[PDB]
Design a protein around this ligand. Structure first.
Ligand SMILES: O=C(O)CNC(=O)C(=O)O
Ligand SMILES: [Fe+3]
Length: 273
């Protein structure tokens, strides 16, 4: 039903690296990624802010329908078999649903929302359910237009609202993931480097044993959130970054990531080799 500010459980984490390419570096997507890899790879994830140069509809906004799934945020980590289908929406109607939910639940800052999100997942006091559009199949000249990367695997669309989540997972086939936020509220990302994958899975098996018994293949299901604070206590390196609209997040082969949204937003991501 509503916010408890004093009950906040915001993770205390190191920030993932942020990159500010120049127009020249930016002119070659694949080449730029390659160049920052040595620096960014040990973190599993990184944020890329495009230069000023870079700069990318009623019938769609109001016309194109998509379906959603329902998430019980209070059950993502602690529960005694996943995301049921939700209503169909358009961007317009989804936004209004999304905006009213936040207005009533709570203008909070990103850190306010993040502290509340983890309160709901670690120590819930009520059922909170939320809706997201994921897996929506779409729908200069540079690979930053995600539709062009498979060339030089198809782009996928994500519509989020406050507290909607993407639970811990690695990309298929040790692929990179490149994610662009088209517009809307910030998305919180938590990343673990490939070399720490074993520590992460093992921390999860240790603390959520009964969950693994009934679902031996949890780690593939995308249905389980797990606190960075718990990970941190098991010696796992978790890095945070906050993605704003107009910004990319890049995930490295074999890196685990998870996160949630601070409000209504729209993003597109693709896998790259
Ligand atoms: O954007 C989301 O909600 C989730 N995206 C991913 O997990 C992907 O970019 O690797
Ligand atoms: Fe992903």
């Amino acid at each position: 039903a509503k916010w408890n500010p004093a009950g906040a459980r915001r993770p205390v984490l190191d920030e993932a690296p942020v990159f500010y390419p120049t127009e020249e570096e930016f002119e070659d997507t694949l080449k730029y990624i390659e160049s920052i890899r040595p620096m960014a790879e040990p973190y599993g994830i990184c944020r890329i802010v495009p230069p000023s140069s870079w700069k990318p509809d009623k019938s769609i906004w109001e016309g194109s329908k998509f379906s959603t799934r329902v998430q019980k945020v209070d059950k993502l980590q602690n529960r005694k078999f996943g995301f049921e289908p939700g209503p169909e929406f358009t961007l317009q109607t989804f936004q209004k649903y999304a905006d009213d939910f936040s207005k009533q639940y709570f203008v909070p800052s990103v850190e306010d929302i993040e502290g509340e999100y983890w309160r709901i997942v670690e120590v819930p006091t009520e059922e909170i359910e939320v809706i997201y559009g994921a897996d929506l199949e779409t729908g200069a000249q540079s690979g930053w237009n995600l539709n062009n990367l498979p060339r030089l695997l198809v782009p996928w669309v994500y519509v989020g609202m406050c507290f909607s989540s993407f639970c811990w997972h690695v990309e298929d086939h040790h692929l990179y993931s490149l994610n662009y936020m088209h517009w809307g509220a910030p998305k919180l990302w938590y990343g673990v480097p490939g070399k720490d994958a074993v520590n992460l899975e093992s921390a999860m098996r240790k603390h959520l044993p009964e969950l693994f018994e009934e679902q031996p293949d949890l780690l593939h299901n995308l249905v389980t959130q797990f606190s960075p604070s718990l990970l941190k206590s098991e010696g796992v390196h978790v890095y945070r970054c906050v993605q704003h609209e107009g910004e990319f997040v890049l995930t490295f082969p074999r890196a685990y990531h998870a996160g949630f949204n601070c409000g209504f937003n729209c993003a597109e991501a693709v896998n790259v080799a």
